[PDB]
């Protein structure tokens, strides 16, 4: 049975970056040629793993994280990066061993008048640990006065909405990102590639 790589790539709906989805690839064989042959990817950068050699390898588990961000924020999805997304939404480890695949999705996730379903986190006390997911909607206390769940002065809702419209600039157009993380623990490797003995 093949690994469900098309299940996360050609999915009709994606998640917001603060609530990024994760598919745990386990107990299947992969066909990484299908990922490389697709020339519609505007961003395809692999850190650590060799893409061609990746075919003839095995791993304990694989993780496919999917979300949508802006165009000018795709650079933040990289090991050792800083910004709003990399610190309060989705953080990659500095020793990351995987691939980041991002493609423009203005013709899918954009709506005239504004697609306000995709959100991101604006305020957060501490940065996000690698592969951490914070989906809390607690009113952020920006001052010394408690908020008590009510929004007001120095009490901000931590989630900002992307104004995704088909007429936006390239930097503000929606981009779908898929991050593949190959975890090789001291366990039976159950996710092998095409050329495995």
């Amino acid at each position: 049975n093949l690994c469900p790589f098309g299940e996360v790539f050609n999915a009709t709906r994606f998640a917001s970056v603060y609530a990024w989805n994760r598919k745990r690839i386990s107990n299947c064989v992969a066909d990484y040629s299908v990922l490389y042959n697709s020339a519609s990817f505007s961003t395809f950068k692999c850190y650590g793993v060799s893409p061609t050699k990746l075919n003839d390898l095995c791993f304990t588990n694989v993780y496919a994280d999917s979300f949508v961000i802006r165009g000018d924020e795709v650079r933040q999805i990289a090991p050792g990066q800083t910004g709003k997304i990399a610190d309060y939404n989705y953080k990659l480890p500095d020793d990351f061993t995987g691939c980041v695949i991002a493609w423009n999705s203005n013709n899918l996730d954009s709506k005239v008048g504004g697609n306000y379903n995709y959100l991101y986190r604006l305020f957060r006390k501490s940065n996000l640990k690698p592969f951490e997911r914070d989906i809390s909607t607690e009113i952020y206390q920006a001052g010394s006065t408690p908020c008590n769940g009510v929004e007001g002065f120095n009490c901000y809702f931590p989630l900002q909405s992307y104004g995704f419209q088909p007429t936006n600039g390239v930097g503000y157009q929606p981009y779908r990102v898929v991050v593949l993380s190959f975890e090789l623990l001291h366990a039976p490797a159950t996710v092998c590639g095409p050329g495995s003995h």
Partner: antibody, heavy 122, light 108 residues
Framework: EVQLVESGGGLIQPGGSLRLSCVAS????????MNWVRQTPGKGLEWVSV???????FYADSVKGRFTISRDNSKNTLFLQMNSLRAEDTAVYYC????????????????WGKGTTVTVSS | DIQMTQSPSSLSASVGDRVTITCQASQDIRNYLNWYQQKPGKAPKIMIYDASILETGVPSRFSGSGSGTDFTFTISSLQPEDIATYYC?????????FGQGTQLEIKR
């Protein structure tokens, strides 16, 4: 209201250093996007540095490598260290929380300080 | 970076006249644009949030409109309590950029 009282501006020879301080009242500097912005009388307003609540810092190209933004949560004060000061850095510096990111009901309050004059000459 | 162009750099208008100031961004900034008013000697005060939102305390004669790459700041009936330098600022994209400025002069 929110008060941002600043200090540290003064005469400094080229190449010297200077630490600008900005004490806040009614605002937690460790929980906001705090910005340093200098205004030359001839050129206008110019963004200098920003620090995030999580600790991330960013500086402008005319400023990178020379300045450094930081904060002290116990004193609730925003600091801007300036090294290798050039004559072009002569301006009035402000600390502020740039407002915006408005929802339908609430906005982030935009509050600027009073400003300190940093002069760089021989 | 995003270059902000503010027009005009200086304008003179009588009391009660309609004042209009245009601002253009080098690229799309959506509605993330603020308008500041700086009195002579004072610090820049926030005047318009996110192109259209009016700061509390600002009179109703002030107004703001526009989106994308073109914005306008309008004063319906000018009063002498408004003479200052006005700036348009874009955030959400570092470096935060401002306009060149617009001096306001009351004709008499």
């Amino acid at each position: 209201e929110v008060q941002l009282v600043e200090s540290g501006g003064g005469l400094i020879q080229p190449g010297g250093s200077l630490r600008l301080s900005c004490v806040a009242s009614g605002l937690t500097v460790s929980s906001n996007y705090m910005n340093w912005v200098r205004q030359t009388p001839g050129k206008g307003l110019e963004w200098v540095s920003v620090i995030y609540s999580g600790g991330s810092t960013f500086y402008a190209d005319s400023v990178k490598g020379r300045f450094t933004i930081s904060r002290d949560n116990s004193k609730n004060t925003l600091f801007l260290q300036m090294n290798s000061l050039r004559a072009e850095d002569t301006a009035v510096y402000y600390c502020a929380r740039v407002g915006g990111y408005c929802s339908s009901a609430n906005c982030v309050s935009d509050v600027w300080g009073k400003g300190t004059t940093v002069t760089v000459s021989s | 970076d995003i270059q902000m162009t503010q027009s005009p750099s200086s304008l003179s208008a009588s009391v009660g006249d309609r004042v209009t100031i245009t601002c253009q961004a080098s690229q799309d900034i959506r509605n993330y644009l603020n308008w500041y008013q700086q009195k002579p000697g004072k610090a820049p005060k926030i005047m318009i949030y996110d192109a259209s939102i009016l700061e509390t305390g600002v009179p109703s004669r002030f107004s703001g409109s526009g989106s994308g790459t073109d914005f306008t700041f309008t004063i319906s009936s000018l009063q002498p309590e408004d003479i200052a330098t006005y700036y348009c600022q874009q955030y959400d994209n570092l470096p935060i950029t401002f306009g060149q400025g617009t001096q306001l002069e009351i004709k008499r």
